[PDB]
Every structure is written in C-alpha cells, then in structure tokens.
Design a protein around this ligand. Structure first.
Ligand SMILES: Cc1cn([C@H]2C[C@H](O)[C@@H](COP(=O)(O)O)O2)c(=O)[nH]c1=O
Ligand SMILES: [Mn+2]
Ligand SMILES: [Mn+2]
Length: 178
C-alpha cells in the first residue's frame, strides 16, 4: 500500500499526508491505510476546489495550522460569517459558506451524520463522497455541477479499482472507524 500511494498521488499530496500523520505520532510506512485515506481526502479537496470558476473557492485543508486559521479569520472578519469551532475544508465565495468534505470507506449517510454531529453549530455545508459513486450533501445542495461531481466520483472509483487490482481494497475498506 505504501508503494501504491507513492505511485498514484502527486508528490505534494504525499508530503502533506506524511506531515499530518507524523504530527499525530503515526508512521506512514506502518499505518498505510490511514496514509492512503489522508491522501485521498486531500486530492478530493483539491479537485473540488478546481470545479468552479476561477476564484470561487478558498482552500483551507492542506495548509499549516497558523495559515489556515488566518484564512478562516480573515474570511469571517470581512464577510461577517460566523467563526467555526474547527477548521473546515474550503470556503465558497459564491454561496458564502464554509465546506466540510468527507470521503468514506463506509456509507455516505452514516458519515454525514458523524460529520454533522461534530459541527453542531452547523453553518458549515457538508459534502460526502464514497468510492462507489454515492454522495450526500447538506439540503441536497451539491454546490458543483454534475460534470464536476462526476469527475471526482470517477477518480475515487478508479482508486478503488486500482487498490483492488493489488488486493489492497479489502483491508482498506475495513479500516474506517466510527
Ligand atoms: C482533523 C483530523 C483529520 N484526520 C484525517 C481524517 C481524514 O482521513 C482526513 C481529513 O479529515 P477531515 O475530513 O476532518 O477534513 O484527515 C485525522 O487523522 N486526524 C484529525 O485530527
Ligand atoms: Mn479538513
Ligand atoms: Mn474533510
């Protein structure tokens, strides 16, 4: 699986993923499924950001903590939006709302509920994707056009197929915990 991650994700994504895990005291070489998951989430966040017009989104995920908060605080101060308790994934300039992106190895509804439970003060939009083409978003408001969403779902399905081709999917699929 380590070889797979290094092989299928671009080096910027891999470096960020390794940094995040090390920050929690985890070794990418050992907790490989987690490593793959972090990379997948990052890729989706980047793809989602590229979906709209130029300038539509601000990427929060993948930034160091100080910078991420600086962006969030700056957005809140200027637009007047309420400040989130935890860092969200992106900011949508057009709809003027923060977005939390979730990618799950389980089922979209359960993950959406788990995400919803964490936000509580839910002014943040939630969008969840699975590796099997399903998606779930707050109020069925999907934000992006179908073509954009299709591109993400396809990339995710492809990752699943590749993992499966290497006999890595069964373990990966079962590594997500409530
Ligand atoms: C906030 C956080 C996320 N993650 C992982 C879970 C996901 O695979 C990825 C993205 O998380 P997020 O969906 O909350 O943005 O980062 C952790 O391992 N520990 C953490 O504390
Ligand atoms: Mn995040
Ligand atoms: Mn997320």
């Amino acid at each position: 699986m380590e070889d797979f991650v290094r092989q299928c994700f671009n080096p910027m994504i891999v470096e960020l993923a390794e940094k995040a895990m090390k920050e929690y005291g985890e070794d990418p070489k050992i907790e490989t499924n987690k490593f793959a998951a972090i990379c997948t989430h990052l890729e989706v966040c980047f793809m989602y950001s590229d979906g709209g017009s130029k300038h539509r989104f601000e990427i929060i995920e993948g930034r160091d903590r100080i910078m991420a908060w600086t962006v969030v605080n700056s957005i809140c101060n200027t637009t007047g939006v309420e400040k989130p308790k935890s860092l969200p994934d992106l900011y949508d300039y057009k709809e003027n709302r923060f977005i939390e992106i979730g990618v799950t190895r389980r089922e979209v509804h359960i993950y959406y509920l788990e995400k919803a439970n964490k936000i509580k003060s839910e002014k943040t939009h939630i969008h969840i994707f699975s590796f099997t083409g399903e998606e779930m978003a707050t109020k069925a408001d999907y934000t992006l056009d179908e073509e954009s969403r299709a591109r993400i779902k396809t990339r995710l399905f492809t990752i699943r197929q590749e993992m499966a081709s290497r006999s890595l999917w069964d373990s990966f699929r079962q590594s997500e915990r409530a």
